[PDB]
């Protein structure tokens, strides 16, 4: 029954987000330094983000317990081909949104009906606010509710590849980002970033207050710029790798502009139609909370 | 005067019957067995020899030919046991959420009223036992209010096809068209076509 | 030509059958606008879950999938007593259900027993640390794991109307420790 | 402190967790699903729909 | 060559295995490891077994099962293509399985 | 004759 | 051993699946009321005997 000192569960060594590359294991901060980019002249301008709709879906009665956490990641950064998922037990979340409920949310990423014996879980009070915002992710494919899978991506590219000199004006030149690679590359970061404990992050966003939110956003604006990069190569138009003499570069076509089908096919992670609606519903919901 | 036996208890028999309604699957079938034989013993109803549903006679006719076959492909056979099972299901407690043997019929001609009339007569001889299946029977009833005659369907669906009874009273119609499926029977969703609100 | 022998001889049939030995749960439907099952569940604090009513397809027996076509035979091919009258004696039904209530109570006995043994219950397994002075393999303080608490103590003190045990203070409250524990 | 993926190193491992399948999940069989004919052909509508 | 950690006469080799295997780095295991339960039905389905194969063959067996379980399409989405092959105004009643 | 049966029906067969 | 046989126990048999079996190891199973969402409620008298 862990608690947060307002440092948050992210101020802990229990679960930390680390990519493995370079023959040893490294933190996200060290990785991003390799991403160097130029310009190709198609101005990607920051639009406004429309507020979400308050109505929460109903968690249709369900016996047993689903791994609510699993699906959140298994859709966003899921590597292995994921079939249609617009359907599913994806809104049991809202059953935590009400005041007095007994249903608890454990560590590891499960949603128990009744707290059982020997299972460590997040604090029942700070998991409430996380739900009154993310249980709203249940209606991701209901017509007349789904977000728009175009404009948010403009917001995304201004984040992982936008030098501050640009974001302060709200406009930037479309970039083509290439870092140096190894073998599997793009697919390897996916099989890696999947098992990260995303819930250990999102809970902090909706609780931690201005004192420990300005400090929280400063140490974690990088764990965000990591699960935002992989989520981006699932959109880019090309992945062709340039060649030096012995070196290899993974030029990525157009980060921040959204096409409709993956450049990866075989080389990188791939999305599906049912997932395009999903990524837009996540990316929209999370940005208001972050920004 | 004393009997004398070990007094038949109220409790326990209620708990041991309740635990059996979670492990033992055929409990329901045994509860039916005891009170269905009572119906057949009281000699309340029994099937007859000949048939006489739709005639008033002088039928078999050329114009009737269409209406004749519509009622014929709806006729249930007077099986002694099938009759008793309907009278018994009316009172007996259930553990599985049963639903209707569904029919696919696009309401095309005036002779298709022989389907909506069946759902009327079923809702009278068995008013309970009609509550449980009220939603799945609603799903095949909306075709009668759309294809047969619209405008009302267009303004009724505008309000929505489902509501929640909560808010300590009142009704909360959700402005969206959805299907029933029966899987959401035991929750906070009442089929909105049976509301009564105008 | 049916309603008389349908709302008299058949009406007094349900009127009595509504109150038998093995019929208990309310299946009332006189207000389709507002009515729900209100189901119960068998749950243990030690990870177990079993409902009484649940979603499933048809079983290997004719209790699921209610046929709605069983209406036309009972309006045409069914002679009534047309109201000679036979009253079924109470003996054959009162004893019938009395023995069915026996099989259940005698069949549910094993798994309610062997299950009960591997539960422990009415125990704690605690440890006491000697606060110097003179020891005694006693006194000191009484430690128990949180999981042992929630299983035995928490569901038992919950039956009565007592506010849940007070949290130990980071600050010192050697004053009201027992005053809040008194409630 | 995480787990280094074993699919990329040299030295061969000789024991690991394999995701099996129980006797409940079954694949590639049949469904006794039934048909119901359109009854009459004359009043079918391919025109728009 | 770890499951014999206390069954061999050869003395030198024994002390060695029960030292690098006892180590605070690695650990051996065998049998049933964990279980994934079912949502609506409530039965065990996908069980993990700490099997005795090698990493090269165990990797291939997991690609298969994962692509069978990440399909998320039940055998009931079969009757939606079985119907594209008959009179335009026909239909089916699926024996729901999930 | 149209006989009264209870459960679901069996006709055509699907394929993997 | 006491004659009273269990032909089927805890096991549910659907006709289109076969014969699935549950566990039988409960503990302090206190029959309690379920709220619509699928959560154990508590003891509110005048509603639960």
mmCIF file of C-alpha atoms in Angstrom, chain C residues 47-156:
data_model
loop_
_atom_site.group_PDB
_atom_site.id
_atom_site.type_symbol
_atom_site.label_atom_id
_atom_site.label_comp_id
_atom_site.label_asym_id
_atom_site.label_seq_id
_atom_site.Cartn_x
_atom_site.Cartn_y
_atom_site.Cartn_z
ATOM 1 C CA UNK C 47 -9.307 -13.783 -3.557
ATOM 2 C CA UNK C 48 -12.539 -15.564 -4.532
ATOM 3 C CA UNK C 49 -15.537 -14.618 -6.697
ATOM 4 C CA UNK C 50 -18.767 -16.454 -7.624
ATOM 5 C CA UNK C 51 -22.069 -14.807 -8.687
ATOM 6 C CA UNK C 52 -25.609 -16.242 -8.481
ATOM 7 C CA UNK C 53 -26.799 -14.924 -11.874
ATOM 8 C CA UNK C 54 -24.453 -14.488 -14.865
ATOM 9 C CA UNK C 55 -24.175 -14.275 -18.671
ATOM 10 C CA UNK C 56 -23.712 -17.513 -20.635
ATOM 11 C CA UNK C 57 -25.049 -19.269 -23.739
ATOM 12 C CA UNK C 58 -27.608 -22.086 -23.633
ATOM 13 C CA UNK C 59 -26.871 -24.927 -21.203
ATOM 14 C CA UNK C 60 -27.096 -28.666 -21.991
ATOM 15 C CA UNK C 61 -30.675 -28.452 -20.640
ATOM 16 C CA UNK C 62 -33.895 -26.682 -21.670
ATOM 17 C CA UNK C 63 -33.906 -23.754 -19.240
ATOM 18 C CA UNK C 64 -32.114 -21.176 -21.407
ATOM 19 C CA UNK C 65 -33.504 -19.644 -24.633
ATOM 20 C CA UNK C 66 -37.208 -19.109 -23.938
ATOM 21 C CA UNK C 67 -39.363 -20.113 -26.898
ATOM 22 C CA UNK C 68 -41.957 -17.436 -27.701
ATOM 23 C CA UNK C 69 -43.922 -19.572 -30.184
ATOM 24 C CA UNK C 70 -45.601 -21.457 -27.297
ATOM 25 C CA UNK C 71 -48.641 -19.125 -27.483
ATOM 26 C CA UNK C 72 -50.717 -20.320 -30.466
ATOM 27 C CA UNK C 73 -51.162 -23.925 -29.208
ATOM 28 C CA UNK C 74 -52.603 -22.636 -25.910
ATOM 29 C CA UNK C 75 -55.260 -20.574 -27.708
ATOM 30 C CA UNK C 76 -56.529 -23.301 -30.048
ATOM 31 C CA UNK C 77 -55.317 -26.883 -29.451
ATOM 32 C CA UNK C 78 -55.934 -26.998 -25.697
ATOM 33 C CA UNK C 79 -59.239 -27.954 -24.087
ATOM 34 C CA UNK C 80 -59.554 -26.786 -20.504
ATOM 35 C CA UNK C 81 -61.764 -28.297 -17.806
ATOM 36 C CA UNK C 82 -63.712 -25.285 -19.163
ATOM 37 C CA UNK C 83 -64.192 -23.714 -15.718
ATOM 38 C CA UNK C 84 -65.121 -32.596 -12.239
ATOM 39 C CA UNK C 85 -62.747 -30.117 -10.577
ATOM 40 C CA UNK C 86 -59.738 -31.827 -8.991
ATOM 41 C CA UNK C 87 -57.847 -30.455 -5.984
ATOM 42 C CA UNK C 88 -54.298 -31.852 -5.689
ATOM 43 C CA UNK C 89 -53.618 -33.025 -2.118
ATOM 44 C CA UNK C 90 -50.892 -31.087 -0.220
ATOM 45 C CA UNK C 91 -48.924 -34.216 0.783
ATOM 46 C CA UNK C 92 -47.133 -34.979 -2.512
ATOM 47 C CA UNK C 93 -45.570 -31.499 -2.849
ATOM 48 C CA UNK C 94 -44.664 -30.604 0.758
ATOM 49 C CA UNK C 95 -42.580 -33.785 1.142
ATOM 50 C CA UNK C 96 -41.265 -33.546 -2.441
ATOM 51 C CA UNK C 97 -39.385 -30.297 -1.741
ATOM 52 C CA UNK C 98 -38.489 -31.337 1.830
ATOM 53 C CA UNK C 99 -36.257 -34.097 0.419
ATOM 54 C CA UNK C 100 -34.735 -31.835 -2.262
ATOM 55 C CA UNK C 101 -33.787 -29.403 0.526
ATOM 56 C CA UNK C 102 -32.065 -32.436 2.085
ATOM 57 C CA UNK C 103 -29.903 -33.451 -0.907
ATOM 58 C CA UNK C 104 -28.498 -29.904 -1.188
ATOM 59 C CA UNK C 105 -27.632 -29.570 2.526
ATOM 60 C CA UNK C 106 -26.028 -33.040 2.479
ATOM 61 C CA UNK C 107 -24.209 -32.556 -0.855
ATOM 62 C CA UNK C 108 -22.765 -29.130 0.039
ATOM 63 C CA UNK C 109 -21.436 -30.478 3.367
ATOM 64 C CA UNK C 110 -18.074 -31.902 2.137
ATOM 65 C CA UNK C 111 -16.685 -28.821 0.321
ATOM 66 C CA UNK C 112 -17.916 -26.520 3.108
ATOM 67 C CA UNK C 113 -15.909 -28.669 5.546
ATOM 68 C CA UNK C 114 -12.579 -29.513 3.835
ATOM 69 C CA UNK C 115 -12.543 -25.907 2.587
ATOM 70 C CA UNK C 116 -13.017 -24.579 6.142
ATOM 71 C CA UNK C 117 -9.988 -26.479 7.512
ATOM 72 C CA UNK C 118 -7.427 -24.953 5.102
ATOM 73 C CA UNK C 119 -8.616 -21.469 6.133
ATOM 74 C CA UNK C 120 -7.222 -21.443 9.676
ATOM 75 C CA UNK C 121 -9.447 -18.751 11.153
ATOM 76 C CA UNK C 122 -9.707 -17.455 14.723
ATOM 77 C CA UNK C 123 -5.930 -17.054 14.938
ATOM 78 C CA UNK C 124 -3.233 -14.546 13.960
ATOM 79 C CA UNK C 125 0.380 -15.810 14.302
ATOM 80 C CA UNK C 126 1.884 -12.788 16.079
ATOM 81 C CA UNK C 127 5.281 -11.867 17.535
ATOM 82 C CA UNK C 128 6.262 -9.896 20.654
ATOM 83 C CA UNK C 129 9.470 -7.864 21.023
ATOM 84 C CA UNK C 130 10.800 -7.553 24.580
ATOM 85 C CA UNK C 131 11.043 -3.860 25.541
ATOM 86 C CA UNK C 132 14.137 -4.598 27.672
ATOM 87 C CA UNK C 133 13.333 -4.345 31.400
ATOM 88 C CA UNK C 134 13.217 -8.078 32.275
ATOM 89 C CA UNK C 135 11.740 -9.731 29.103
ATOM 90 C CA UNK C 136 9.583 -12.866 29.772
ATOM 91 C CA UNK C 137 8.950 -14.033 26.176
ATOM 92 C CA UNK C 138 5.851 -11.872 26.645
ATOM 93 C CA UNK C 139 4.661 -8.238 26.924
ATOM 94 C CA UNK C 140 6.594 -5.716 24.798
ATOM 95 C CA UNK C 141 4.486 -5.025 21.707
ATOM 96 C CA UNK C 142 2.188 -7.106 19.483
ATOM 97 C CA UNK C 143 2.994 -7.260 15.753
ATOM 98 C CA UNK C 144 0.744 -8.719 13.053
ATOM 99 C CA UNK C 145 0.991 -8.622 9.247
ATOM 100 C CA UNK C 146 -1.543 -6.405 7.426
ATOM 101 C CA UNK C 147 -2.962 -9.291 5.353
ATOM 102 C CA UNK C 148 -3.778 -11.363 8.458
ATOM 103 C CA UNK C 149 -5.540 -8.285 9.852
ATOM 104 C CA UNK C 150 -7.812 -7.678 6.835
ATOM 105 C CA UNK C 151 -8.921 -11.319 6.594
ATOM 106 C CA UNK C 152 -9.976 -12.039 10.191
ATOM 107 C CA UNK C 153 -10.119 -8.748 12.107
ATOM 108 C CA UNK C 154 -11.392 -6.355 9.412
ATOM 109 C CA UNK C 155 -14.448 -8.309 8.191
ATOM 110 C CA UNK C 156 -15.433 -9.084 11.802
#
